[PDB]
Amino acid sequence: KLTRIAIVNHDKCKPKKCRQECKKSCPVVRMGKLCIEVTPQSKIAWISETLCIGCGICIKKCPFGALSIVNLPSNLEKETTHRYCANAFKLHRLPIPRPGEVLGLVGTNGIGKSTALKILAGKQKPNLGKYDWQEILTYFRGSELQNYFTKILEDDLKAIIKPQYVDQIPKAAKGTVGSILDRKDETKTQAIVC
Amino acid sequence: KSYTTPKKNKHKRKKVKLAVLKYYKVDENGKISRLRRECPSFMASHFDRHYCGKCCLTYCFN
Amino acid sequence: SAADRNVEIWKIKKLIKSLEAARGNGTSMISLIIPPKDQISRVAKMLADEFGTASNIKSRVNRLSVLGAITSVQQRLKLYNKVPPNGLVVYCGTIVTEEGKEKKVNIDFEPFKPINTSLYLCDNKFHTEALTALLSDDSKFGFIVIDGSGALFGTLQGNTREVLHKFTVDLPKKHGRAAQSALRFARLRMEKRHNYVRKVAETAVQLFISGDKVNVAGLVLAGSADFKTELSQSDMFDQRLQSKVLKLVDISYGGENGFNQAIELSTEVLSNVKFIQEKKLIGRYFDEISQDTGKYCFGVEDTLKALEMGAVEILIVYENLDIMRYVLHCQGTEEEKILYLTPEQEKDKSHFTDKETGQEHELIESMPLLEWFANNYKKFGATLEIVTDKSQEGSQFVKGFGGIGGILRYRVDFQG
RNA sequence: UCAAAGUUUAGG
RNA sequence: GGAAGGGCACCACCAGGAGUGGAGCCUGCGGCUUAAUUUGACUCAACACGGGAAACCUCACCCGGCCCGGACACGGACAGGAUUGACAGAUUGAUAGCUCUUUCUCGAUUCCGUGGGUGGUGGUGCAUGGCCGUUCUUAGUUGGUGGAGCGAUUUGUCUGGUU
RNA sequence: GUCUCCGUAGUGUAGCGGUUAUCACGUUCGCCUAACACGCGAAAGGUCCUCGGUUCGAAACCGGGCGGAAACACCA
Ligand SMILES: Nc1ncnc2c1ncn2[C@@H]1O[C@H](COP(=O)(O)OP(=O)(O)O)[C@@H](O)[C@H]1O
Ligand code: SF4
Ligand code: SF4
Ligand SMILES: [Zn+2]
């Protein structure tokens, strides 16, 4: 029980400079099947992970090093919460938020950590591997996400995020430290927090 | 029905009726001159022979 | 000679192909096969009863064609006085074909290799499943059969069960009824017993080797009392012979009555050798893809071009591949081109108009590529290695890589 | 006023 | 039915004859052989049978070649003559104008589709008809009405004698 | 190793120095039968294991070759 995941790094993948390459090196496409699709024009070199073998020929060939084929357990295919595009990142779960209980996320970055927080914040809709809210709640039943998402979708819960990049905030807001806290007062708890 | 390569078909003929055919010339408008020689019993100008086109008579001056 | 054998094999391969295509009416054909030990009189008796029973076939067309077919084979068998070695394979009938040409046919031949298969059949078509099944499995295995009584050596094609050599020995007793001499006689007994293993190992080098490289793709020891174990692991046993020891069989009985017991036990392991050689080769092919290297090829567009040029060293092929070599021809200008096409690109294809001149470019009939590879790999680079889709590495090679590839003589660049 | 005499396409 | 009563036939026997089987050849068939050795029929009821004694023809078989005898229509093809039919000489087996170079010609024939025919000693006698042969050369076979049986059936069409 | 014996048409065996090498089966060919079987009538087939010797003459008698098969191998 194992399956491949095709990935293309869109920052590096330029179809125009390299020509095709992947197509010319693929034993699926040299046979003659729709495994890899690029054309001279059109951005992002598409792959099907179904038709792909997982031989790692195309990854070695691509001149920028745009591609990657990593294997995942076939157990996880059932449990997708978010995959943004084909040949892209594929999150499989969300944490299980509890009310009045500080949720501790821990694990290395680039493993769907920001996507999870954005989904829980309610910016992103769980596309759930499709790429719809009753269908999403039904997917997340018997679990605290349906409790969490119901709450989100009628009672508009206020999504606020302490950001990762702290050095980007100074070049946006202006004035004194005391002035900004006075402007954002809702609780009126300046002093005790200070 | 395996037809052999070197034997092949044998194409039948194709005629060439090269427009209207001429056997006469105009001498002094009124009179006429005859080009080709005629049957005794237009017999053609074969490269050496003189072959008929009906009664199958033939001639050649040596 | 070796070349004359290969021509005789190809002759029979061609003949076999023409007989499977034959086709005929009801059950007018005969497929008959005779093993080498068999008597012809017994076969001629069998046909005489089959002739008698055929006399009461109700339908006309079938009946009269059968009887005449049975009479022909009876007369062919009168010419031989014995069934030759390698058996006999008699193929009678009255085949239908183009031009409405219901023609009588008879092909008796002693085949190359010995055949251990009997078969009587009548049918609408001929049945060469025995012959083609033989032609695939040329793989010989050896059988050394040790016993305290005496040894035996023999070989084993997919069908045929041979005896090469055997001897019997006057071995000593187990015990010595003196106290002092017990030990000396026991050493003496063990030295006689070792000399016997040596002789068997020597005779085994005599028989199974050929030009300092053994003919048998394997070798089996079969015995009891840990006597095969004495031979197998001994330094006496030559390592070129020892490295092909696949089974050490435990058998009741000894000699030729133990032989066929040893074969029955050794079946799965002797079948698996082809599967193991497949894995080893495609495993060697796949390592070049796993690394950078670049001493590989794949696809008829590439693999053939590689073979044409700076040639391959090994040319891996899947049996089933179905890709075929057509010869396209022009009506007027007499221009031609050959291409290697897939099952859908060969069956119907509007590509083949001449275009430049402006005519219909007729695709004159094919032959299909596994056969083409075999025809002239000798005039290229060679080692045409047929593989199956059974192994995990083979399955990838068939399903993924299109069942065609090769291990090259050096690094090669490719473009487009 | 008692010898021996077995068998019978898969091919409709 | 290697059950029993009767009664019969030289395609049964008896008593005999003439024989065939043995020899040579004539001829039919099966096989092998071949380019092809065309084929049908294999117990009586296949095999001096097909009326079958083939030099040619017959003739299907084989290997070579010409010819259309391709109706009629619908059309296309209609004349810058559609495109039937031609001594050479090379070739050819041929004195087949079959083909290549050339003649010139019926002059409304043609060529191409399609529909569609036509022909067929091609296949199927297990698709049939007719015609023969055989069971079967013996004495056998049938319904109406009546009677017997639920009925299939039987009775009539029979113990006996006689032919 | 010893001593012993046996190597005969396809199979199993006879064979008293002068034989067409005996018998049975098997084989082919007729017939019988619708066919087969049985049955009837015919036919063909031996390197007499191998070589050398003795002999007027050897399948045999004698020698050695190559095979095959029994009995012995005990007292410590
Ligand atoms: N809007 C987008 N469209 C296409 N690709 C994206 C987008 N956002 C992110 N990606 C790709 O997905 C990868 C991981 O992003 P993401 O999953 O958001 O980060 P994290 O794993 O930290 O949550 C990036 O390398 C990027 O190339
Ligand atoms: S991985 Fe090997 S197979 Fe799958 S696409 Fe890239 S190349 Fe073709
Ligand atoms: S993948 Fe690397 S190579 Fe294939 S197209 Fe996109 S960029 Fe060019
Ligand atoms: Zn004239």
Short mmCIF file of N, CA and C in Angstrom, two decimals, chain C residues 319-375:
data_model
loop_
_atom_site.label_atom_id
_atom_site.label_comp_id
_atom_site.label_asym_id
_atom_site.label_seq_id
_atom_site.Cartn_x
_atom_site.Cartn_y
_atom_site.Cartn_z
N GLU C 319 7.72 -10.38 -24.61
CA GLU C 319 7.25 -11.33 -25.61
C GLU C 319 6.13 -10.65 -26.37
N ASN C 320 5.30 -9.92 -25.65
CA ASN C 320 3.92 -9.69 -26.05
C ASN C 320 3.77 -8.44 -26.90
N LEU C 321 4.88 -7.77 -27.18
CA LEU C 321 4.90 -6.32 -27.29
C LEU C 321 3.99 -5.89 -28.43
N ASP C 322 4.01 -6.65 -29.51
CA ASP C 322 3.03 -6.51 -30.59
C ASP C 322 3.41 -5.44 -31.59
N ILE C 323 4.55 -4.79 -31.39
CA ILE C 323 4.90 -3.68 -32.27
C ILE C 323 5.43 -4.36 -33.53
N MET C 324 5.16 -3.79 -34.70
CA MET C 324 5.41 -4.50 -35.97
C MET C 324 6.05 -3.65 -37.07
N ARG C 325 6.86 -4.33 -37.89
CA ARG C 325 7.65 -3.71 -38.96
C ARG C 325 6.93 -3.83 -40.30
N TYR C 326 6.28 -2.75 -40.72
CA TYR C 326 5.65 -2.67 -42.05
C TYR C 326 6.62 -2.11 -43.07
N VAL C 327 6.33 -2.35 -44.35
CA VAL C 327 7.13 -1.84 -45.47
C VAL C 327 6.21 -1.06 -46.42
N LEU C 328 6.30 0.27 -46.35
CA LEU C 328 5.40 1.16 -47.09
C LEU C 328 5.99 1.44 -48.48
N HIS C 329 5.11 1.56 -49.48
CA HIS C 329 5.51 1.63 -50.89
C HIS C 329 4.65 2.64 -51.67
N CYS C 330 5.27 3.31 -52.64
CA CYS C 330 4.61 4.32 -53.47
C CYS C 330 4.16 3.75 -54.82
N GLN C 331 3.07 4.28 -55.35
CA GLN C 331 2.49 3.79 -56.61
C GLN C 331 3.30 4.24 -57.83
N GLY C 332 3.58 5.54 -57.92
CA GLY C 332 4.23 6.13 -59.10
C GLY C 332 5.75 6.22 -59.02
N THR C 333 6.25 6.97 -58.04
CA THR C 333 7.68 7.30 -57.94
C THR C 333 8.60 6.17 -57.46
N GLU C 334 8.02 5.09 -56.91
CA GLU C 334 8.78 3.93 -56.42
C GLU C 334 9.63 4.23 -55.16
N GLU C 335 9.21 5.22 -54.37
CA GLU C 335 9.83 5.54 -53.09
C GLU C 335 9.24 4.64 -52.00
N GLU C 336 10.06 4.28 -51.01
CA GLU C 336 9.64 3.38 -49.93
C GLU C 336 10.24 3.77 -48.57
N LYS C 337 9.61 3.27 -47.51
CA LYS C 337 10.07 3.50 -46.13
C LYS C 337 9.51 2.42 -45.19
N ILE C 338 10.34 2.00 -44.23
CA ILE C 338 9.93 1.01 -43.21
C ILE C 338 9.82 1.69 -41.84
N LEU C 339 8.76 1.34 -41.10
CA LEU C 339 8.48 1.94 -39.80
C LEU C 339 8.01 0.87 -38.81
N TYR C 340 8.26 1.11 -37.53
CA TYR C 340 7.92 0.18 -36.45
C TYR C 340 6.72 0.72 -35.65
N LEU C 341 5.55 0.11 -35.88
CA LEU C 341 4.25 0.69 -35.49
C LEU C 341 3.54 -0.07 -34.38
N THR C 342 2.73 0.66 -33.62
CA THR C 342 1.93 0.11 -32.52
C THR C 342 0.65 -0.55 -33.07
N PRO C 343 -0.10 -1.32 -32.23
CA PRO C 343 -1.33 -1.99 -32.70
C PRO C 343 -2.42 -1.11 -33.32
N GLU C 344 -2.56 0.13 -32.84
CA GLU C 344 -3.56 1.08 -33.37
C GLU C 344 -3.02 1.91 -34.53
N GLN C 345 -1.73 2.25 -34.49
CA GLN C 345 -1.07 2.97 -35.58
C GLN C 345 -0.79 2.10 -36.82
N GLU C 346 -0.90 0.78 -36.68
CA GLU C 346 -0.73 -0.16 -37.80
C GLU C 346 -2.06 -0.63 -38.43
N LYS C 347 -3.11 -0.76 -37.62
CA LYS C 347 -4.40 -1.28 -38.08
C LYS C 347 -5.12 -0.31 -39.02
N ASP C 348 -5.18 0.97 -38.63
CA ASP C 348 -5.76 2.03 -39.47
C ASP C 348 -4.98 3.32 -39.25
N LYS C 349 -4.50 3.92 -40.34
CA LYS C 349 -3.59 5.07 -40.27
C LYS C 349 -3.63 5.89 -41.56
N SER C 350 -4.16 7.11 -41.46
CA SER C 350 -4.26 8.04 -42.60
C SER C 350 -2.97 8.82 -42.89
N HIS C 351 -1.96 8.67 -42.03
CA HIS C 351 -0.60 9.20 -42.25
C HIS C 351 -0.04 8.87 -43.64
N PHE C 352 -0.25 7.64 -44.10
CA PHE C 352 0.47 7.10 -45.26
C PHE C 352 -0.12 7.49 -46.63
N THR C 353 -0.29 8.80 -46.82
CA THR C 353 -0.31 9.41 -48.15
C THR C 353 1.08 10.00 -48.34
N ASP C 354 1.56 10.01 -49.58
CA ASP C 354 2.94 10.43 -49.87
C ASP C 354 3.17 11.94 -49.68
N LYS C 355 2.10 12.74 -49.77
CA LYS C 355 2.08 14.18 -49.43
C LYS C 355 2.92 15.08 -50.35
N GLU C 356 4.24 14.90 -50.35
CA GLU C 356 5.15 15.68 -51.20
C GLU C 356 4.80 15.58 -52.69
N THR C 357 4.60 14.36 -53.17
CA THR C 357 4.18 14.11 -54.55
C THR C 357 2.66 14.25 -54.70
N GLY C 358 1.92 13.64 -53.77
CA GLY C 358 0.45 13.71 -53.75
C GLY C 358 -0.20 12.43 -54.24
N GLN C 359 0.15 11.31 -53.59
CA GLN C 359 -0.40 9.99 -53.91
C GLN C 359 -0.68 9.19 -52.64
N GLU C 360 -1.37 8.06 -52.80
CA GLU C 360 -1.66 7.14 -51.70
C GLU C 360 -0.48 6.18 -51.53
N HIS C 361 0.12 6.17 -50.34
CA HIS C 361 1.32 5.39 -50.06
C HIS C 361 0.90 4.07 -49.41
N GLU C 362 0.84 3.01 -50.23
CA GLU C 362 0.28 1.73 -49.79
C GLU C 362 1.22 0.99 -48.84
N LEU C 363 0.67 0.54 -47.71
CA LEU C 363 1.45 -0.16 -46.68
C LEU C 363 1.48 -1.66 -46.99
N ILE C 364 2.56 -2.11 -47.64
CA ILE C 364 2.75 -3.52 -47.97
C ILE C 364 3.06 -4.29 -46.68
N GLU C 365 2.59 -5.53 -46.61
CA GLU C 365 2.42 -6.27 -45.34
C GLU C 365 3.68 -6.47 -44.49
N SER C 366 3.43 -6.76 -43.21
CA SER C 366 4.43 -6.66 -42.15
C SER C 366 5.20 -7.95 -41.86
N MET C 367 6.15 -7.84 -40.93
CA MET C 367 6.40 -8.87 -39.91
C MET C 367 6.68 -8.26 -38.52
N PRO C 368 6.44 -9.08 -37.43
CA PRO C 368 6.23 -8.37 -36.16
C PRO C 368 7.35 -8.61 -35.14
N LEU C 369 7.77 -7.56 -34.43
CA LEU C 369 9.19 -7.29 -34.19
C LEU C 369 10.01 -8.30 -33.36
N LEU C 370 9.48 -8.83 -32.26
CA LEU C 370 10.21 -9.95 -31.62
C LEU C 370 10.86 -10.90 -32.63
N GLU C 371 10.12 -11.23 -33.69
CA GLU C 371 10.64 -12.08 -34.76
C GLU C 371 11.79 -11.39 -35.51
N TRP C 372 11.64 -10.10 -35.81
CA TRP C 372 12.69 -9.32 -36.49
C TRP C 372 13.96 -9.24 -35.66
N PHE C 373 13.82 -9.06 -34.35
CA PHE C 373 14.97 -9.02 -33.45
C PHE C 373 15.78 -10.31 -33.57
N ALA C 374 15.09 -11.44 -33.46
CA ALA C 374 15.69 -12.78 -33.59
C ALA C 374 16.36 -13.02 -34.95
N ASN C 375 15.79 -12.45 -36.02
CA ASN C 375 16.34 -12.61 -37.37
C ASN C 375 17.78 -12.15 -37.54
#
